Design an enzyme around this catalytic site. Sequence first.
Site, PDB file in Angstrom:
ATOM      1  N   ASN B  90       0.842  -1.182   0.000  1.00  0.00           N
ATOM      2  CA  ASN B  90       0.000   0.000   0.000  1.00  0.00           C
ATOM      3  C   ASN B  90       0.875   1.228   0.000  1.00  0.00           C
ATOM      4  O   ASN B  90       1.132   1.848  -1.084  1.00  0.00           O
ATOM      5  CB  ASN B  90      -0.897  -0.009   1.258  1.00  0.00           C
ATOM      6  CG  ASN B  90      -1.689   1.284   1.381  1.00  0.00           C
ATOM      7  OD1 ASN B  90      -1.597   2.201   0.524  1.00  0.00           O
ATOM      8  ND2 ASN B  90      -2.544   1.354   2.409  1.00  0.00           N
ATOM      9  N   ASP B 189      -1.590   2.577  -4.309  1.00  0.00           N
ATOM     10  CA  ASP B 189      -2.082   1.455  -3.510  1.00  0.00           C
ATOM     11  C   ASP B 189      -2.751   0.488  -4.431  1.00  0.00           C
ATOM     12  O   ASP B 189      -3.957   0.556  -4.710  1.00  0.00           O
ATOM     13  CB  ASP B 189      -2.989   1.947  -2.359  1.00  0.00           C
ATOM     14  CG  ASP B 189      -3.510   0.781  -1.584  1.00  0.00           C
ATOM     15  OD1 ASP B 189      -2.986  -0.331  -1.594  1.00  0.00           O
ATOM     16  OD2 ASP B 189      -4.581   1.059  -0.928  1.00  0.00           O
ATOM     17  N   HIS B 345     -10.065   1.748 -10.132  1.00  0.00           N
ATOM     18  CA  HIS B 345      -8.740   1.343 -10.633  1.00  0.00           C
ATOM     19  C   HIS B 345      -8.982   0.449 -11.842  1.00  0.00           C
ATOM     20  O   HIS B 345     -10.058  -0.105 -12.005  1.00  0.00           O
ATOM     21  CB  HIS B 345      -7.978   0.436  -9.642  1.00  0.00           C
ATOM     22  CG  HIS B 345      -7.121   1.213  -8.725  1.00  0.00           C
ATOM     23  ND1 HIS B 345      -5.885   1.650  -9.156  1.00  0.00           N
ATOM     24  CD2 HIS B 345      -7.323   1.601  -7.453  1.00  0.00           C
ATOM     25  CE1 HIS B 345      -5.331   2.290  -8.142  1.00  0.00           C
ATOM     26  NE2 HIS B 345      -6.191   2.255  -7.099  1.00  0.00           N
ATOM     27  N   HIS B 379      -5.252   6.082  -9.873  1.00  0.00           N
ATOM     28  CA  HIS B 379      -4.711   7.445  -9.729  1.00  0.00           C
ATOM     29  C   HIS B 379      -3.724   7.683 -10.941  1.00  0.00           C
ATOM     30  O   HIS B 379      -2.487   7.793 -10.778  1.00  0.00           O
ATOM     31  CB  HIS B 379      -3.938   7.556  -8.430  1.00  0.00           C
ATOM     32  CG  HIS B 379      -4.777   7.234  -7.242  1.00  0.00           C
ATOM     33  ND1 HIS B 379      -5.761   8.113  -6.804  1.00  0.00           N
ATOM     34  CD2 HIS B 379      -4.703   6.177  -6.383  1.00  0.00           C
ATOM     35  CE1 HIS B 379      -6.311   7.571  -5.705  1.00  0.00           C
ATOM     36  NE2 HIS B 379      -5.670   6.417  -5.415  1.00  0.00           N
ATOM     37  N   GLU B 404       2.226   9.648  -7.790  1.00  0.00           N
ATOM     38  CA  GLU B 404       1.926   9.304  -6.403  1.00  0.00           C
ATOM     39  C   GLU B 404       3.234   8.948  -5.709  1.00  0.00           C
ATOM     40  O   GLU B 404       3.913   7.998  -6.169  1.00  0.00           O
ATOM     41  CB  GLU B 404       0.944   8.094  -6.174  1.00  0.00           C
ATOM     42  CG  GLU B 404       0.830   7.840  -4.649  1.00  0.00           C
ATOM     43  CD  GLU B 404      -0.424   7.086  -4.274  1.00  0.00           C
ATOM     44  OE1 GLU B 404      -1.440   6.915  -4.952  1.00  0.00           O
ATOM     45  OE2 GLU B 404      -0.336   6.722  -3.039  1.00  0.00           O
ATOM     46  N   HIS B 406       3.485   8.436  -2.136  1.00  0.00           N
ATOM     47  CA  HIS B 406       3.002   8.255  -0.776  1.00  0.00           C
ATOM     48  C   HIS B 406       4.099   7.804   0.176  1.00  0.00           C
ATOM     49  O   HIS B 406       4.094   8.201   1.327  1.00  0.00           O
ATOM     50  CB  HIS B 406       1.862   7.196  -0.835  1.00  0.00           C
ATOM     51  CG  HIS B 406       0.859   7.216   0.281  1.00  0.00           C
ATOM     52  ND1 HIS B 406      -0.412   6.641   0.121  1.00  0.00           N
ATOM     53  CD2 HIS B 406       0.944   7.762   1.537  1.00  0.00           C
ATOM     54  CE1 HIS B 406      -1.084   6.903   1.262  1.00  0.00           C
ATOM     55  NE2 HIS B 406      -0.283   7.540   2.166  1.00  0.00           N
ATOM     56  N   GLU B 449      -1.707  11.614  -3.095  1.00  0.00           N
ATOM     57  CA  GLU B 449      -0.864  11.330  -1.968  1.00  0.00           C
ATOM     58  C   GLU B 449       0.599  11.453  -2.316  1.00  0.00           C
ATOM     59  O   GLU B 449       1.441  10.520  -2.282  1.00  0.00           O
ATOM     60  CB  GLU B 449      -1.176   9.889  -1.503  1.00  0.00           C
ATOM     61  CG  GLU B 449      -2.650   9.732  -1.070  1.00  0.00           C
ATOM     62  CD  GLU B 449      -3.071   8.332  -0.626  1.00  0.00           C
ATOM     63  OE1 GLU B 449      -2.867   7.322  -1.240  1.00  0.00           O
ATOM     64  OE2 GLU B 449      -3.763   8.285   0.485  1.00  0.00           O
ATOM     65  N   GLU B 525     -12.106  10.810  -1.897  1.00  0.00           N
ATOM     66  CA  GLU B 525     -12.302   9.454  -1.452  1.00  0.00           C
ATOM     67  C   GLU B 525     -13.110   9.464  -0.157  1.00  0.00           C
ATOM     68  O   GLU B 525     -12.786  10.270   0.722  1.00  0.00           O
ATOM     69  CB  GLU B 525     -10.965   8.750  -1.114  1.00  0.00           C
ATOM     70  CG  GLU B 525      -9.971   8.696  -2.323  1.00  0.00           C
ATOM     71  CD  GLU B 525      -8.628   8.025  -2.042  1.00  0.00           C
ATOM     72  OE1 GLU B 525      -8.465   7.183  -1.143  1.00  0.00           O
ATOM     73  OE2 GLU B 525      -7.729   8.350  -2.971  1.00  0.00           O
ATOM     74  N   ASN B 585       4.074  -7.047   2.470  1.00  0.00           N
ATOM     75  CA  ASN B 585       2.826  -6.873   1.748  1.00  0.00           C
ATOM     76  C   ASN B 585       1.763  -6.299   2.667  1.00  0.00           C
ATOM     77  O   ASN B 585       1.912  -6.232   3.878  1.00  0.00           O
ATOM     78  CB  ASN B 585       2.289  -8.151   1.111  1.00  0.00           C
ATOM     79  CG  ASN B 585       1.859  -9.140   2.190  1.00  0.00           C
ATOM     80  OD1 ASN B 585       0.799  -8.984   2.825  1.00  0.00           O
ATOM     81  ND2 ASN B 585       2.734 -10.113   2.452  1.00  0.00           N
ATOM     82  N   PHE B 589      -5.633  -5.322   2.243  1.00  0.00           N
ATOM     83  CA  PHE B 589      -5.903  -3.926   1.944  1.00  0.00           C
ATOM     84  C   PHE B 589      -6.157  -3.675   0.488  1.00  0.00           C
ATOM     85  O   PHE B 589      -6.607  -2.574   0.165  1.00  0.00           O
ATOM     86  CB  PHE B 589      -4.891  -2.962   2.559  1.00  0.00           C
ATOM     87  CG  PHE B 589      -5.383  -2.625   3.968  1.00  0.00           C
ATOM     88  CD1 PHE B 589      -5.000  -3.389   5.080  1.00  0.00           C
ATOM     89  CD2 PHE B 589      -6.288  -1.585   4.199  1.00  0.00           C
ATOM     90  CE1 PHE B 589      -5.504  -3.083   6.349  1.00  0.00           C
ATOM     91  CE2 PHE B 589      -6.783  -1.267   5.472  1.00  0.00           C
ATOM     92  CZ  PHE B 589      -6.393  -2.025   6.573  1.00  0.00           C
ATOM     93  N   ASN B 592     -11.083  -3.320  -1.554  1.00  0.00           N
ATOM     94  CA  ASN B 592     -11.925  -2.262  -0.972  1.00  0.00           C
ATOM     95  C   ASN B 592     -13.143  -1.949  -1.843  1.00  0.00           C
ATOM     96  O   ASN B 592     -13.708  -0.859  -1.705  1.00  0.00           O
ATOM     97  CB  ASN B 592     -11.143  -0.924  -0.765  1.00  0.00           C
ATOM     98  CG  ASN B 592      -9.671  -1.089  -0.356  1.00  0.00           C
ATOM     99  OD1 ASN B 592      -8.823  -0.517  -1.088  1.00  0.00           O
ATOM    100  ND2 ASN B 592      -9.315  -1.896   0.685  1.00  0.00           N
TER     101      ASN B 592
HETATM  102  C1  LIG Z   1      -3.808   3.060   5.664  1.00  0.00           C
HETATM  103  C2  LIG Z   1      -3.803   4.601   5.540  1.00  0.00           C
HETATM  104  C3  LIG Z   1      -2.717   5.182   6.436  1.00  0.00           C
HETATM  105  S1  LIG Z   1      -3.510   5.130   3.789  1.00  0.00           S
HETATM  106  C4  LIG Z   1      -5.089   4.745   2.986  1.00  0.00           C
HETATM  107  O1  LIG Z   1      -4.955   3.419   2.520  1.00  0.00           O
HETATM  108  C5  LIG Z   1      -6.156   3.036   1.869  1.00  0.00           C
HETATM  109  C6  LIG Z   1      -5.778   1.580   1.696  1.00  0.00           C
HETATM  110  O2  LIG Z   1      -6.928   1.022   1.004  1.00  0.00           O
HETATM  111  C7  LIG Z   1      -6.260   3.776   0.532  1.00  0.00           C
HETATM  112  O3  LIG Z   1      -5.059   3.540  -0.233  1.00  0.00           O
HETATM  113  C8  LIG Z   1      -6.337   5.269   0.893  1.00  0.00           C
HETATM  114  O4  LIG Z   1      -6.281   6.044  -0.329  1.00  0.00           O
HETATM  115  C9  LIG Z   1      -5.180   5.666   1.779  1.00  0.00           C
HETATM  116  O5  LIG Z   1      -5.378   7.023   2.196  1.00  0.00           O
HETATM  117 MG   LIG Z   2       2.589  -6.797   5.966  1.00  0.00          MG
HETATM  118 MG   LIG Z   3      -1.481   5.742  -1.494  1.00  0.00          MG
HETATM  119 NA    NA Z   4      -6.382  -0.372  -0.741  1.00  0.00          NA
END
Ligand SMILES: CC(C)S[C@@H]1O[C@H](CO)[C@H](O)[C@H](O)[C@H]1O
Ligand SMILES: [Mg+2]
Ligand SMILES: [Mg+2]
Ligand code: NA
Lengths: 204, 1011
Positions: B90, B189, B345, B379, B404, B406, B449, B525, B585, B589, B592
């Site tokens: 992520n 992500d 996405h 993104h 991005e 992040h 981000e 978002e 990993n 996550f 979603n």
């Molecule tokens: C886990 C947060 C600190 S970041 C959070 O993670 C989500 C994961 O699905 C998405 O990527 C969001 O865009 C992101 O802000």
């Molecule tokens: Mg992990």
């Molecule tokens: Mg991100």
């Molecule tokens: Na995600």
Amino acid sequence: AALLQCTADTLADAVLITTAHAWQHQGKTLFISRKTYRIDGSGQMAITVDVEVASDTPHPARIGLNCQLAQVAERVNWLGLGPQENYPDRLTAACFDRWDLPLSDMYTPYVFPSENGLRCGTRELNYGPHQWRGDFQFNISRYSQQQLMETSHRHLLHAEEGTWLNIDGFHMGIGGDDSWSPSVSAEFQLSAGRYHYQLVWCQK
Amino acid sequence: RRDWENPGVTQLNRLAAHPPFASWRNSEEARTDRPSQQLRSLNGEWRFAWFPAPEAVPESWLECDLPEADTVVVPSNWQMHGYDAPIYTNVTYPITVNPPFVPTENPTGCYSLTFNVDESWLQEGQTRIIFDGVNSAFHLWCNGRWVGYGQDSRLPSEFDLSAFLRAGENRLAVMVLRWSDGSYLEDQDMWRMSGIFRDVSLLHKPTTQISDFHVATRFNDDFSRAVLEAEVQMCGELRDYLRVTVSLWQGETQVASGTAPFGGEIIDERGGYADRVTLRLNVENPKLWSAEIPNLYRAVVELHTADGTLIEAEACDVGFREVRIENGLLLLNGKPLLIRGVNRHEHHPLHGQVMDEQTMVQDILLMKQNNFNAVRCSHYPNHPLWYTLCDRYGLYVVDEANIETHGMVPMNRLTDDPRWLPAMSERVTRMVQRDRNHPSVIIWSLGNESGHGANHDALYRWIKSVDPSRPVQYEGGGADTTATDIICPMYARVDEDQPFPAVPKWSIKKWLSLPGETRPLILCEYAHAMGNSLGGFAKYWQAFRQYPRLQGGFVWDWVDQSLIKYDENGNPWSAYGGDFGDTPNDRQFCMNGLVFADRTPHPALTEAKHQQQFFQFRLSGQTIEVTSEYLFRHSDNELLHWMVALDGKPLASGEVPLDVAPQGKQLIELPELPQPESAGQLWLTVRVVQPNATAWSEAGHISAWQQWRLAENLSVTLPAASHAIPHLTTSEMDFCIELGNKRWQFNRQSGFLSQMWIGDKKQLLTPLRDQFTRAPLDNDIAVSEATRIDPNAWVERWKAAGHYQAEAALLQCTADTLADAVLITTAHAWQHQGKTLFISRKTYRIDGSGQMAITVDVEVASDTPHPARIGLNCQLAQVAERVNWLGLGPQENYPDRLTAACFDRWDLPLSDMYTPYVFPSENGLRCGTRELNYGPHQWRGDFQFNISRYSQQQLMETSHRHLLHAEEGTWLNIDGFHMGIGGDDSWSPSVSAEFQLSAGRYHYQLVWCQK
Ligand SMILES: CC(C)S[C@@H]1O[C@H](CO)[C@H](O)[C@H](O)[C@H]1O
Ligand SMILES: [Mg+2]
Ligand SMILES: [Mg+2]
Ligand code: NA
Ligand SMILES: [Mg+2]
Ligand SMILES: [Mg+2]
Ligand SMILES: [Mg+2]
Ligand code: NA
Ligand code: NA
Ligand code: NA
Ligand code: NA
């Protein structure tokens, strides 16, 4: 009130009374109250109340019980919010503690009389030789609600014989955002449809 | 040189960016958008070989196919073919953070293709190759000679091969690096993959050609008049006989046309652009474009000699619309939008990041069917067909630059650094150059981000100067910086402030009014749909409708990024982070979505459809008021269906056509109804149905619904006396009650109902016991790890307090014989290490009719964390085919996610009562249930329940749905109370207070009987 059921059972260490009543108007059932009274060897009377309120009737002002006690006592002592009068939507200033006031302080002399003097969040209430335990709201005074509603000015109120006690499982907010339209917020209206409350009445 | 480790080199010999071309040589083919002979696809079977680093590639590869290579399909991501693993991370980068370098082991994919070129293409003009998407960087050779290099995985890289090709057979060699300096700007992500994952084509253009064209539409005050202005640029041989003709078509009708020679207005002391021309077309009463009515015209751009020879033609679909922010509101054609958006996405469970027309269409259909009107390209720029489809089907689009970072620390380390301005500029400028003529694009985004850097400020201004027709937004650095025209926070709550230092996320309602603020607010978002989520969604919609400047948002996100894996047996199963050996990993996550990777909806989708409805309703008496939230169309494909039922039994229903103008109201007076004296609650349900099919829906599609309770007739009628009285038998260990063919056994040591027989058939596999926990939802776990416990997450708080391991202590268990029943009374205490967490007091009254009435009163210690649920559970011995209930449904619904559910009588197959979330958790609950029927049993009360072949313990212990196994019997969970599921975000506690079980004392009651 219309009776639906009135039964008595003996259990090993107690007697259980079971009742059910409906309140109706122009043939419509407004409220249904189901209760149990369990009287045990300790002399404590446990009252359980389950009420149904028809969804289409206006949300009621309160869901409680009331009675006129034969006696009059000097003080009122409770463990709940206080010391002053407080209502659901107007109880932030009150504090949870053990309060003790003369009976008259439990009555608020608003010039135009109305329901008044409630205390919410009460877990124990003591009056004369009586004690009531639970999680309720209450008011206690020499004036019936009937009187308060029939009387325009506080100077015209007269103490009735005994003491009127209103003990509520739930009570509607008082509102006030304005006083010329419905002003009680939704969250303070009794709109849940089904309500439960329980109390223990015993002797002190 | 290692150009892939130098942000100063983002390409070599790459052609300029421009809008989609096809070089038609016939104007009618251009008008009709038919295929062009001058635009060929090189998609298909290619030759491929994988290497662990670029240094391992042998030079022979430049001139000859490698014997050990494989033939593979292109476009593709090589991880999808098994060459190496895709990685799911992520925030943290997948490579060591040491810009501009990359690992020396850097997977290199050697692609090649032997293809044909006809002589005619080489007798004149220019032949270029176009790679729509190569991740992350690549060198290109043609016939063994080096042509060029490109970066930016999400935009096309074009190279002129004119001088490298020969008639007949030619061979391309493309060396694709998985990692490059461009990777530092591609930390989104999602799964990290690589390869030639978008289309590859060959385009022939004439030597004298249209090199770019920009179409703009401006209007008068009431949109009754417009001027289309088309700026056209040429490259090549400039001569006085050249002209450009721009013609505008509405279907087969030519609405306007203009012709002009080249030579724009004087612009400065040195003159004007002699290689440019601007045509201006007046259009009266133009048909306007919106997501509601995507009216389009076709503009054909002809480059020709004045005397009539068409050189080439280019063209585009045009949508006449104005986008502007005025007085704090984002307006479309002068009206304020309400964005029912979703982030999407590009993801396919088999193909990875390769998109295809079918999939895209499938997604737009479902989006529209579910009342979405807008999409954010999270993104990065999308495959080109996406824009065409949103222009035609009608969706508002936020086009986002592929930037991005992040994982940097702080997040703007690269974006505030002038050295990275060049790399970032390309990502923004090339996107605008390519997508500026699509009407669906309404807002430009600077990426995601990447903190807030001065590079953002510069680029914000560049777009504002080159394209004044669209607002620019950017969330980084606190969502309201000087680089955004729109306040566009991610996961800001409706009423709750989250005052983080430097980048607080204020309540959206409060944010709008901070001192000096005036911009509109649209969340880029919100409503993180991970697992069983979307709790509190309606709170956002109520706010959006109430505050003009709250103009909506984009849900995160459309589709779960799960990938397909196969078990020994060869059966497919849904995989997530770590499932490929990838580590570090981010586990689940990646999932979603509102929909599963195969496009099957998750339950939350219906909640979004409902809150995003375009018609609002009010009930007064028997008058229904319908209000339209459409801004432009009338309700010309809509009828109102109404039905009244008493406890699920239909009593009356009808239909009324809806005729309501945009933003209008229609009053509908319902007929004299049923005034039934029979017990129950009357319920009115209304639904808006579209009688005619559309491009995006079938006839009869339901677009909105709402329900209201009408009159209620409480039952006051007494049960008929029974000619029987249950018998009680006692022993030190049990209380046994018998009545007719029925028997109940209560254990005196545990204090629970241990068994029940119907006839002489046992009904339970496990006793009926209280339950105060749930197999934790993704939102309950949040970011907790065993390796990194997060002490504030719900799961951890419950764990720590002992909820999962507290043991019931028996405090009392009695049996009494009444006149007409047996009454069993019990009380238990749940404790943990010294502390009493919960006390359960119950009565079971078994009467002569065979019914068992259960009353439960629980006390919850005020200092223990609020529990997940307050209910009972048991494993029933039977397994029955169907589940029939009177309550909210038909789909799964939770306290904070039940507005879409309707109260009615539902009947589904057992399996439909389980939601196969990829990561298993508590699931399938249905709330506000009055009666539940399963096999011979019936349960009545006012509760929430779930029923399935999987225990809460099993769900809590299994990480993937494919590993679950039906247990013997059926597990039933019947709750008096259940905590909300949350989801405003999935990495902090997100259940709203009003949905936490903090009352201290709880009462519920049920009656279990037969049939
Ligand atoms: C886990 C947060 C600190 S970041 C959070 O993670 C989500 C994961 O699905 C998405 O990527 C969001 O865009 C992101 O802000
Ligand atoms: Mg992990
Ligand atoms: Mg991100
Ligand atoms: Na995600
Ligand atoms: Mg480079
Ligand atoms: Mg012509
Ligand atoms: Mg020739
Ligand atoms: Na009065
Ligand atoms: Na709004
Ligand atoms: Na209609
Ligand atoms: Na699990």
